[PDB]
Assembly symmetry: D2
């Protein structure tokens, strides 16, 4: 570390000698893990490079479509590039999705009908999916439930997917048509599901039912591993372009990838029956989406490095963390158990102060939920960010970092508010 | 008093002949009183829009450039308030995210219907693009209303008019009818589009038996053609395309839904998802163009109306049955011409393409049980407030002309097209 | 005529009074023949623009989204060819990179002048924004023509007209005179703008003595107001702003230079740099709006002209001196009104701001109304005035005649009852 | 620890061979300490950018969408401030209006020169693109400095170094010398680019003789490669391109000028016009991308530096002469390789094209690989070479080190096995 970097961190940010010694130890400790992620990153960069070349991407795919957007070659080729990367029959990538929940919800709705049953098998889903499902019948929101779609949820057993109950439900209920698997844990204290764990779960599903649609919410997992859920038997997946796969450059949108049958059904929900993905001009965003995809394998691993570094420094400082720095990652999220409300809030506020945009904004608990979100793209979580519900045992979630230098610095700034 | 240089260019470059120029002079004189009538309406509508801008205090800060989630895009949210004011509705939902007007119409229907509910169309067969929304072919799996348990009834016209007595009989008999669908603009037929005063009476009749059924009007092509909109005469919810009238020729994509807050809000959950609705959705930097387009819409709409009315008269002077007639007061921007001959139809449509500023050199081909042909040489792909024309190829070979960013363009296009049929 | 609900809304919202509404009905009737005349010109110009589009085979592929160097931006390069066709010139250079019209004008001048050359303005004192380009304050270091050794001469008007005999005497005497500057639109004065036929005669006189001197015309506010442009009557080079007439109210920034290839090319080296010229310059995805703007320009321009003409008549009927009169055939979109009272001027201009769709609530030495979609776009309804005797105000623009008309009624109602 | 499937894919898709893979493992190990060194600089620069953003209080409101004149575009004005903070200068002028880096350099030059002034280049012959700006071909009329009466002196290098004693002698004898031109990055030559410490000494020597002469540094390709910039060691004004380092691979066009307010302001009058300068100029909605690109610039620049250093070592290990050597600390992102053979040169450059994500299939006197997202952006993996003895090729860029690395492997496999 240059003398001038250290002087500046101490004077400008009040980073103290205690935190700097933790920093030196943590950075040395994560070196072998980091070399492991570099190998994945290189494979993934090549994977993406190959897809671009096989689709013959050129300046002409950087379209500026208008109106109906009939024959937007840029738009249609990107879908082909995503299908190739995910090893799927089809893909549907659009700026029109307002967030990742929109993509997930469209995949769900598109592939469900009255009297079908949807079954989540990783316990309670992410809060934003509750209205899509219809978990509150005092509200009229056009949920699955309101359209006659039944819902089953399998709690985790011994902290793992209760695969024996999943199989028994499949044997006993012919109306189950789609199983929902969530790759990234939300607000809990449980490790996100690795690709090999998804692979086994699907292997067990197929022993019982070869037809049920297996859907995986892939948000935050893209390019973290050398494979995606589609490589291990997922029929359809969805995610958000302002997380990993947009490389920090995409300004909005989402994707759905998988079997043509299922992707196509989702598209009729995203637009309307009879139109699907055949119309939809793209506002001039195609170059950003392409460049973002190309930079995604790299930026994803900057973020993963940030998470692994955070896990180790916080563990050394005395905090319980999940996952541990040497637990191989499947997503970019890092959880830290503060066990103290003030420590939680001080930490999150620290991340905001480490942010390039709105660094001066004082984070307020809006159970209330506090967030650091000083990013170029509003809501992008590939950029350094953090959030947490305010409740015992005061776990915070950190994710993102356009560069590891930024993530690292953020953590140093934040930890410096908690220990000296 | 066409300038000598204009006449020379038209005759030399476009092979417009003296017979056509004589029809032009007569037609222009014949439609002058009609044009003055539309100017009165335009003035009113221009003022209605200006007041809506000023009441919402539109400023430069509404010309947003939102990203990501688009949480608190003040431009977007204020445009919704401006449209709600113009249409005299509780709410509105205007977004570039709609891929076409069919999407906006579909979202309004899906959002406000549930399994075991019945939707009822009362103006006969809907526009072709709605057939999959409804679910008219049970051999296709397209996620239609029918596939979601929504029943469908359709009331044929009787003696060319909405059969208001059968509509009432259906409402008395069928408790499950939750939404009535009115299409303002006729599609491919030989029937005048429904005027606002006609819609008013239809609704007044519905309200004699049932004050709760949702009255939905597909308002495509009708915005600013009259001094009132369907929402001013009892419509609960309306939908349209921003690349037709209301975009002023400047909007590059999108749609709108307007009406009662309850029904607009339900539509938003179909457009995005339950729980989000219109709370998320950045707008790609399009807001300035949508506002400016709205401001210019009353004007541009009436340029297209004038083109339709002038077309009606001149083709009639040439011997053709047209609909509506030049002096039938309009409710939309569409003009139909019965060519009664396949070649004449095709030649006319190709001539429209050749009169266009974009893709003028493209040779239109007959590209449903019948082939369709289209002239679509426009700055915005598929925009029909720009001069365009289309037709299914079937007897008696009716063609449909609409649009014109300026009346001069529309007029020139008709002369060019007509000079391919008569000499 | 005006619908009852329009009348009521105007009265209730803007306190438009009966006197003003009676003047409206008279003025509108009075200007109808003039309006028919402008419609003939509009029709011709619309056709000539359409023909230029068709001749360049404009297609959706011209709606470019170029990046970096912008090598081979076909939309860019075709628009230049479409303008050159419209203006009947060898070349044109149309770019969003010009920050305003003064930038385009400046580039045309700098590009075609060298040290020891003399520029001569022949319509008296140029618009204030050109003063630094010329270099009229020797206490400022601004990179002016004077700082680069370019001499300047300015011929005053004589009896209100261009002093053509002095122009010719100067040309006979001073062989360093390389460029003559003509300003089509009058600025802040009380003098009618120069019509195309007046420009034709001036250039014919110049050409009696000298066929080599560059004749440059600042064409701002003039585009599509007549059926000809200065390039049709002997101008070697012209320049203007895309946020005035020729952008059709759609263009968001930029400018143009049109004329002989030799002079347009020299201009381009000043806009970028020697050896690059117009060969580089990506265009930010603005191409579709520039093409559409151009297509709608003949129409929008005439809406603004009607607004001026209607304004001239109603204000004359209300008792004010106006220039030009409603029946003086126009060459630009500007209308001047001599208020002879500071408070009447200010109230008028504040009225125009309250009639505006954007920033209608914003409060407003030089006073300005500028509540527009595009910042500083003067094809949109706007007005301005320096605060000095005899308190002349300048109105210009109107995306639609209805908007311009409504604004004049709102503003006039603040002055008379 | 290259994964087995990475290896198989490289061999099977690109015919990468075992010899090249063996050299890869060696070279990667050999450059590790150099890489750790660049990570220290990257961390420092990352922090210095972050501080600049925070000191200017960058917010979502800086992500402007200005129109027309662009008066008070706060995103635009704040970015100038951020740049000025980063470069430790009084002022900066950052605009998408620059068509390339040459435009920015040319404007800084023209803006600060007047007739009878002399410009002196002190690093030998400038980059070819500057020749018309200076005016080196008296048979062309291109608006060059020469055509505006600006004299030119050029001091040849002596024994490969800046001839500082000649520079001082010139300054002592020629009072008309107003600006000194230093080029940081070597062009198409075989000489190491000038390090910041070398620039510091040059300026220190200049200041022993003349405290007033303007010292201009063309900074292209050098941003964020060292922990200081030329403005930190005495430069009065610098210029560069936003589609090179400082755009972070995200900027789609534009350039920057930074330095003393006096000199930057004079440059702005050349970029637009006298009296306007940088006060007008809307920015087409590009602001977010320029801010994010700047934030990512320290990182992306070092990825490109790593690519160059890795290239240097692997190519050295393969038997080629390279400049600089892998262990010569860098000042820019360029790597030169002397092929001593026309075909090897061409084959190498064709390889780089085949490794590109955009236009990878496009076929390619000066040969170039340029399969990039932003047209002409040299921060992305690219290569070029004039075809002349001794067949030196120039490699630069890489949005990620993995990309640069894979490109060198693909290209090198075409030459050895
Ligand atoms: Na694949
Ligand atoms: Na209202
Ligand atoms: Na011409
Ligand atoms: Na500083």
């Amino acid at each position: 570390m240059l003398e001038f970097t250290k002087r500046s961190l101490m004077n400008k940010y009040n980073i103290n000698e205690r935190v700097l010694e933790l920093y030196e130890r943590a950075l040395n400790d994560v070196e072998k893990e980091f070399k492991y992620y570099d190998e994945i990153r290189e494979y993934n960069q090549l994977k993406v490079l190959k897809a671009f070349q096989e689709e013959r991407i050129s300046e002409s795919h950087f379209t500026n479509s208008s109106g109906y957007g009939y024959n937007d070659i840029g738009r249609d080729s990107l879908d082909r590039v995503y299908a190739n990367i995910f090893n799927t029959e089809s893909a549907f990538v659009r700026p029109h999705f307002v967030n990742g929940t929109h993509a997930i919800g469209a995949a769900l709705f598109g592939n469900l009908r009255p009297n079908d049953t949807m079954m989540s098998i990783c316990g309670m889903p992410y809060d934003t999916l509750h209205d899509i499902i219809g978990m509150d019948d005092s509200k009229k929101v056009g949920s699955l439930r309101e359209y006659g779609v039944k819902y089953k949820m399998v709690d985790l057993k011994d902290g793992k997917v209760d695969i024996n109950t999943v199989k028994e439900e499949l044997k006993k209920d012919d109306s189950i048509k789609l199983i929902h698997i969530q790759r990234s844990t939300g607000y809990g204290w449980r490790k996100s599901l690795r690709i090999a764990e998804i692979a086994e779960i699907i292997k067990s599903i197929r022993e019982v039912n070869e037809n049920v649609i297996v859907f995986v919410d892939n948000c935050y997992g893209e390019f973290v591993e050398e494979k995606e859920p589609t490589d291990v038997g997922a029929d359809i997946i969805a995610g958000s372009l302002i997380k990993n796969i947009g490389g920090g450059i995409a300004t909005t949108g989402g994707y759905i990838a998988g079997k043509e049958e299922y992707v196509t059904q989702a598209t009729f929900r995203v637009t309307v029956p009879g139109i699907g993905g055949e119309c939809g001009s793209t506002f001039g965003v195609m170059r950003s989406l392409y460049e973002g995809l190309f930079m995604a394998p790299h930026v994803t691993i900057e973020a993963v490095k940030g998470a692994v570094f955070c896990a180790r420094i916080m563990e050394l400082a005395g905090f319980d963390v999940l996952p541990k720095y040497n637990d191989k990652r499947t997503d970019i999220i890092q959880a830290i158990k503060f066990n103290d409300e003030k420590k939680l809030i001080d930490f999150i506020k620290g991340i905001q102060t480490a942010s390039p945009v709105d660094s001066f904004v004082q984070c307020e608990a809006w159970d209330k939920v506090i967030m650091a979100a000083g990013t170029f793209v509003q809501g992008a979580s590939i950029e350094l960010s953090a959030d947490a519900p305010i409740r015992e045992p005061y776990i915070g979630y950190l994710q993102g970092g356009l560069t590891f230098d930024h993530a690292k610095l953020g953590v140093l700034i934040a930890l410096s508010k908690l220990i000296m």
